[PDB]
Structure 1
Amino acid sequence: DKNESATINEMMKHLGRSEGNPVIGVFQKFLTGHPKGAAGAWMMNGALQILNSGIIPGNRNADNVDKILEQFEYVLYPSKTLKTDGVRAVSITSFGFGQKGGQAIVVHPDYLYGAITEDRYNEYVAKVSAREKSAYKFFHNGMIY
């Protein structure tokens, strides 16, 4: 938590993140634990629960953060949930034994469909709706039996 947070500072201290544009510490582990090798998904799942939701959770077990994290002015450490007008990107970063660390990030899909033509989009659209339904069906036929 101390070194996972410094770095963030630099990589924003180095890329020109506007002073006063911190990035919001999500800590999906106060609930669950450390799934050793599973983490990156639990937190790569959230990210998408988030992206489309617009929400940001918080460590509902954060009594009091450490003073020494105040020098990391490029970050926050919430403890209460936060609905938003919209997220546009996210960062996952894993630091495991052996130094094989990691950093994945994410973008909001809707920054995609602007790469293409209308007719192809609304064509994609319908082809999905059907799915959700057929999927809705399965999920429940199976969930029951």
Structure 2
Amino acid sequence: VASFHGTSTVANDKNESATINNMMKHLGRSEGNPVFGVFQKYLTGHPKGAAGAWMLNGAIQILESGLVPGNRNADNVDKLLEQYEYVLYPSRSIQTDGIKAVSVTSFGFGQKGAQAVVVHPDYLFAVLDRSTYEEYATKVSARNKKTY
């Protein structure tokens, strides 16, 4: 996915897609493998300060469940964005079979933009041997009941 900043403004919604398309182009995405656009600002609004946090929780919840939310106000995607092949603009929640990693780009005044990338927790657990993983799992279980 690419959790877009997506502040429903004229310039932002095109510039963000432009950057995503160009950077997925330069890195050589396999043609016809676009990243999905999720646009929480449709639903939550734009928390002028904390936009990135909502976007990042969205990214992590996505990594966990595998669902991909949709812009349920995607009335009609602007014609200009068809030129950005390497992106997709869903408007309907689509539960997929699992997501590897999610991008989070957010743009600010005075040209301080930023981008985070959240890879799935599973690929972390595979760096470590069996005993450590199983022993960690037990402590997690215990903590889970305690927090519950």
2:14 maps to which residue? Answer: 2
Residue 81 (structure 1) aligned to one of 93, 114, 120: 93
Deviation at 1:98, TM superposition (A): 1.1
In 1, distance between residues paired with 2:19 and 2:110? 18
Deviation at 1:83, TM superposition (A): 0.3
In 2, distance between residues paired with 1:116 and 1:34? 40
* 2:102 is the counterpart of 1:90: yes
Residue 58 (structure 1) aligned to one of 70, 74, 77: 70
3-state DSSP of counterpart to 1:93:
strand
Deviation at 1:37, TM superposition (A): 1.2
In 1, distance between residues paired with 2:64 and 2:44? 22
In 1, distance between residues paired with 2:138 and 2:111? 45
**TM-score (ref. length: structure 1):** 0.92
Q: For residues 4-43 of structure 1, what are the structure 2 equivalents within 5 Å? A: 4-43=16-55
Deviation at 1:14, TM superposition (A): 0.3
Amino acid at match of 2:142: A
Residue 45 (structure 1) aligned to one of 57, 63, 83: 57
In 2, distance between residues paired with 1:132 and 1:98? 43
Structure 1 stretches (4+) deviating beyond 4 angstroms? none
Render the CA deviation track for 1:46-82: whole Å, top value 9, x for unaligned. 1111101000000000100111000000001111001
1:133 maps to which residue? Answer: 145
Amino acid at match of 1:52: E
In 1, distance between residues paired with 2:134 and 2:95? 28
Amino acid at match of 1:110: D
Which segments of 5 or more consecutive residues in structure 2 lack a partner in the other structure? 1-12
Identity percentage over the alignment? Answer: 76
Which segments of 5 or more consecutive residues in structure 1 lack a partner in the other structure? 137-145
**C-alpha root-mean-square deviation of aligned residues, in Å?**
0.5
Relative contact order higher in (CA < 8 Å, ≥ 6 apart): 2
3-state DSSP of counterpart to 1:30:
helix
Larger Rg: 1
3-state DSSP of counterpart to 2:141:
helix
In 1, distance between residues paired with 2:24 and 2:103? 12
The alignment covers a number of residue pairs equal to 136
